[PDB]
Amino acid sequence: PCELLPVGVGHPVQAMLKSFTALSGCASRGTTSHPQEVHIINLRKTAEVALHLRPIQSLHVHQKPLVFILNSPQPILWKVRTEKLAPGVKRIFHVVEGSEVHFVKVETLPHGNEHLLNWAHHRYVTSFSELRMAHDIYIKVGEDPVFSETCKIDNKFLSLNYLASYIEPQPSTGCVLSGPDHEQEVHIIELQAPNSSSAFQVDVIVDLRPLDGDIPLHRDVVLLLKCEKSVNWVIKAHKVMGKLEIMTSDTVSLSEDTERLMQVSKTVKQKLPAGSQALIQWAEENGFNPVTSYTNTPVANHFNLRLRE
């Protein structure tokens, strides 16, 4: 009954790959004696990027003038979203030809990290973040006394103060076999890898909610989760009430909300077969009938499961 095809937008399971995008960076305590803070972004490929501004957990309300060297190879639309910024303080953004800012000086900047650092040294450094790509960049403004007085680029450097994320839709293979039948849905997610690296025992989020979004559902859910690598399945339910049964050999983390909304059956580890045919067969033999859908994804760490009605 399963005829696998590359899945469309209407397939109930939509895969994504959310990643942290840091390549190299540094941070410094050195900007203390100077008048403005200098935060450098070196982006590595019109596209828009969200720049989220907030102070370090130490600071209540950030008062120090800021300068942002925002390097990109091709132009980008920078939409700055700030929290706890003193209005009226000098806001300077050094940007490339064609780039624009929201909520400013146009420059010719070098592409290398040390050259871009050298460009900043010549004019004025608190932080440098080289990023692979980015939808959103999160920067915590303030001098952290944990860093050295110098900013020395390191490809193994990561601070929670300077982060950037990217969400990439991922193609899947799959089939929808039946509709919700006995106020229940049974979904099989066969994942090949959680990421594009050797990052072991990572979280794979299963976001479970109605396709509508405003009207909460009374629906029982069975999930058969399979991966050929070790993963931690994170179940995040929203606006769905009913039984939740997870059939997997991996570890399962339930959201605080999954527990208040759903009656989660005790996760008893199960060894499942591989491939669409074997997995559909296993489900029916174990009393999870009829199967709503099957999805095969080569690489993903986030699945959006949407329930009909």
Give your account of this protein's structure.
The protein contains three helices and 24 strands. The chain has two domains: 19-167, no CATH class; 172-307, no CATH class. It has helices at residues 113-123, 256-261, 276-285; strands at residues 5-6, 13-20, 22-27, 37-43, 47-55, 66-71, 76-82, 91-95, 100-102, 105-106, 127-131, 136-141, 162-170, 173-176, 184-193, 203-210, 217-218, 220-227, 232-237, 240-247, 251-254, 262-264, 293-299, 302-307. With 309 residues, it is mainly β. It is elongated, with a radius of gyration of 24 Å. A ten-stranded mixed sheet has the order 9-7-5-12-13-2-24-16-19-21. It is found in: Cell membrane; Secreted. This is Transforming growth factor beta receptor III. It comes from Danio rerio (Zebrafish).
Helix-strand blueprint:
Elements: E1 5-6, E2 13-20, E3 22-27, E4 37-43, E5 47-55, E6 66-71, E7 76-82, E8 91-95, E9 100-102, E10 105-106, H1 113-123, E11 127-131, E12 136-141, E13 162-170, E14 173-176, E15 184-193, E16 203-210, E17 217-218, E18 220-227, E19 232-237, E20 240-247, E21 251-254, H2 256-261, E22 262-264, H3 276-285, E23 293-299, E24 302-307
Parallel strand pairs: 4-6, 4-11, 5-7, 5-12, 6-8, 7-9, 8-10, 15-18, 15-23, 16-19, 16-24, 17-20, 18-20, 19-21, 20-22
Antiparallel strand pairs: 1-14, 2-13, 2-24, 3-11, 12-13, 14-23
